């Protein structure tokens, strides 16, 4: 970063923001991960037992990425608007 | 050598 004694670029420019502690304990699930559990029910503890999310994760979201073919029940997770349609289009059901 | 003896 040394620029000859001129004030360098990472120090003429201002700092911004703060780090959220809640962002580190939250994950996102894709539609390709819903067929990698065993039981056909998808909650937080089945996603942890299949090594999909980490052990410190306390919140998760299913997003529209990839595809799901099987009937799947989702328990206690958040679902996006398009992924609720895609889980219900494959015969699944979403409850909180 | 004591060089400072040289007259400058």
């Amino acid at each position: 970063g040394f620029e000859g004694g001129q004030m360098p670029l990472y120090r003429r420019l201002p700092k911004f923001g703060f780090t959220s502690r809640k962002a580190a304990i939250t994950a996102e699930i894709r539609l390709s991960d819903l067929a990698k559990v065993e039981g056909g029910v998808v909650d937080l503890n089945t996603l942890k037992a299949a090594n999909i999310i980490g052990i410190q994760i306390e919140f998760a979201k299913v997003i529209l990425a990839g595809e799901v073919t099987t009937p799947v029940t989702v328990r206690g997770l958040r679902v996006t608007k398009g992924a609720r349609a895609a889980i219900e289009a494959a015969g699944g059901k979403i409850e909180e | 050598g004591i060089f400072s003896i040289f007259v400058i």
Binding site: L9, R12, L13, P14, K15, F16 | -
Partner: protein, 64 residues
Amino acid sequence: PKIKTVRGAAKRFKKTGKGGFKHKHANLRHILTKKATKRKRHLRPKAMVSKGDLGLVIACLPYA
């Protein structure tokens, strides 16, 4: 040993979706009264780092 992050650069740059970096504009901390409103309005959103300075940021952020 591991490379250490320049921790003051990690407080000023964030990596975007294709590998560029964003930063907050300068000149918006104090004497704001004498400045025009159009000038202060354009300094509010975040910008991208130019091409010539990207390698200097990459040197500061080996783990970004």
